[PDB]
């Protein structure tokens, strides 16, 4: 039989994309404009959370299922196809909260996902040699199968209840639906490889969103160049320059955030559900960076507009990195089982890692405060941080050594 690892990777390489799809409507967007933008942000966040919950269920499922073969791979592909429709169905439901057809479609999506997962469980247990070794030696194989089936089919059951009740009173259906996401929390390790794969996929997609847009839209047209720019191609490129600047900033920020994430996870011994939650929040907010940078690159009709956009960029960068730092703190709370020895309290790289993770929250906080105190140079300082933070990463060892030496003579 097969080594399941690669297959799971592909699933993540799929789910990441499905998780991030609803970002694109946000970027392409221009009481009317602001409300619409906020609606798109809310829809994107909810879709990302839903896809993350589905991914968590998948990760647990294939944690139980150790090895795989042909039929398991095909059923996993079918499950992936069913999960791919969650963004679209959810968007339909939200855009049409009145008619029951939308909630019915979303509930059918969830039901299909859970049914495929239950079929996978049944096939795996019918061939115990596929299951993980601890499950194989589990004397509760029948009871364990019963419990796993209950867990997997709870979601579909609640969704079926919501669908039936939608024909009469939809609020009950909505409550039953949120129950699906609530109960698994209300009534554990996430295999590090799965978390790493999903996070890397999300980071890559978010980093290359803006170049995707640029290649799809900005490539000059010879007719346009000859007519509007009178054949001066360099003028045509300088016209779209701002999108290049925004992409440069987005790639810098997202790449350095991924660098901090990589440094953190290199020393993590054993992930946890709490770290999973915090990582999910961190990624959901990392998704916002391209929007912030697009807004920054755009014109500012009034000083207040530019100040507000700088505020938003700083706030997004903060929210993105603060949860990443909180992951590290939560790990420190269970240091013995969570983190490598080299990053324990007083460890050789403990302070270095702390600075590496806290570099972005602190810089963003200073930039945000600049708006409340130094509105004169506010935007400028923002630009400065965009160049300051990368440099500190190159010099991080020397910078931390300087800080420690300064504290020595304090």
Ligand X SMILES: CCCC[C@@]1(C2CCCC2)Cc2cc(OCCCc3nnn[nH]3)c(Cl)c(Cl)c2C1=O
Per-residue binding string, its own copies, 152-191, x by CB under 8 A, is ----------------------------------------
What is the number of alpha carbons within 13 Å of residue 296 lying toward its C-beta?
27
d(CA 287, CA 210): 12
3-state secondary structure labels for all residues of 313-360: HHHHHHHHHHHHHHHHHHHHHCHHHHECHHHCCCCCCHHHHHHHHHHH
Bridge partners, residue 2, by sequence = 68
Among 62, 125, 265, 293, binds its own copies (CB under 8 A): 265
Among 184, 189, 347, 390, binds ligand X (CB under 6 A): 390
Binding partner selected for residue 249 from ligand X, its own copies, none, CB under the kind-specific 5 to 8 Å limit: ligand X
Q: Is 253 in the site for its own copies (CB under 8 A)?
A: no
Among 141, 192, 269, 383, binds ligand X (CB under 6 A): 383
Q: Is 237 in the site for ligand X (CB under 6 A)?
A: no
Q: How far is CA 208 from CA 58, 212, 246, 249, 349, in A?
A: 26, 6, 11, 11, 31
Among 328, 386, 392, 400, binds ligand X (CB under 6 A): 386
Binding partner selected for residue 383 from ligand X, its own copies, none, CB under the kind-specific 5 to 8 Å limit: ligand X
**Segment contacting ligand X by CB under 6 A, of 51-59, 109-117, 243-251, 399-407:** 243-251
Binding partner selected for residue 347 from its own copies, ligand X, none, CB under the kind-specific 5 to 8 Å limit: none
CB of 298 to its own copies, least distance (A): 20
Nearby residues of 133 by Cβ (< 8 Å), 6 or more positions away = 66
Please choose, from the candidates 294, 364, 285, 355, the residue with its C-alpha nearest in 3D space to the C-alpha of residue 319.
Answer: 285
Q: Is 387 in the site for ligand X (CB under 6 A)?
A: yes
Among 1, 36, 38, 81, binds ligand X (CB under 6 A): 81
Among 37, 45, 46, 92, binds its own copies (CB under 8 A): 92
d(CA 222, CA 280): 44
CB of 69 to ligand X, least distance (A): 14
Q: Which two tokens stand for residue 73?
A: 């791979």
Contact by Cβ (8 Å): 23, 254: no
**Segment contacting ligand X by CB under 6 A, of 60-68, 247-255, 263-271, 402-410:** 247-255
Q: Note the residue count of the chain.
A: 410
- Give the number of other CB atoms < 10 A from CB of residue 345: 8
Residues of this chain that interact with ligand X (CB under 6 A) are: 74, 77-78, 81, 245, 248-249, 252, 255, 383, 386-387, 390
């Amino acid at each position: 039989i097969q080594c399941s690892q690669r297959m799971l990777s592909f699933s993540d390489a799929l789910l990441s994309i499905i998780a991030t799809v609803m970002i694109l409507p946000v970027t392409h967007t221009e009481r009317s404009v602001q409300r619409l933008l906020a609606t798109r942000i809310a829809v994107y966040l909810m879709t990302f959370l839903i896809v993350t919950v589905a991914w968590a269920a998948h990760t647990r499922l294939f944690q139980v299922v150790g090895k795989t073969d042909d039929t398991l791979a095909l059923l996993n592909l079918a499950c992936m196809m069913t999960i791919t429709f969650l963004p679209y169905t959810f968007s339909l439901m939200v855009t049409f909260p009145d008619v029951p057809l939308g909630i019915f479609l979303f509930c059918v999506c969830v039901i299909a996902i859970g049914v495929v997962q239950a079929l996978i469980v049944g096939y795996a247990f019918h061939f115990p040699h596929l299951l993980s070794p601890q499950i194989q030696r589990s004397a509760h194989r029948a009871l364990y199968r019963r419990h796993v089936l209950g867990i997997v089919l709870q979601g579909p059951a609640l969704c079926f209840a919501a669908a039936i009740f939608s024909l009469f009173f939809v609020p009950l259906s909505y409550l039953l639906m949120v129950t699906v996401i609530l109960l698994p929390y209300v009534s554990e390790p996430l295999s590090k490889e799965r978390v790493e794969a999903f996070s890397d996929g999300v980071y890559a997609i978010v980093a290359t969103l803006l170049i995707l847009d640029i290649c799809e839209d900005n490539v000059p047209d010879p007719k346009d160049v000859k007519e509007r720019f009178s054949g001066s191609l360099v003028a045509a490129l300088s016209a779209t320059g701002p999108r290049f600047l925004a992409y440069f900033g987005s790639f810098a920020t997202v790449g350095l955030l991924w660098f901090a994430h990589h440094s953190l996870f290199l020393h993590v011994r054993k992930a946890t559900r709490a770290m999973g939650l915090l990582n999910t929040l961190s990624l959901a907010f990392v998704g916002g960076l391209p929007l912030a940078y697009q807004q920054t690159s755009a014109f500012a009709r009034q000083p207040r507009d530019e100040l507000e956009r700088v505020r938003v960029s700083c706030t997004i960068i903060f929210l993105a990195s603060i949860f990443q730092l909180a992951m590290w703190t939560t790990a420190l709370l269970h240091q013995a089982e969570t983190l490598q020895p080299s990053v324990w309290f007083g460890g050789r790289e403990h302070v270095l890692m702390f600075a590496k993770l806290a570099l972005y929250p602190c810089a963003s906080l200073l930039a945000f405060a600049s708006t409340c105190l130094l509105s004169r140079f506010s935007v400028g300082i923002f630009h400065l941080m965009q160049i300051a933070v990368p440099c500190a990463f190159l010099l991080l060892r020397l910078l931390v050594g300087l800080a420690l030496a300064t504290l020595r003579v304090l």
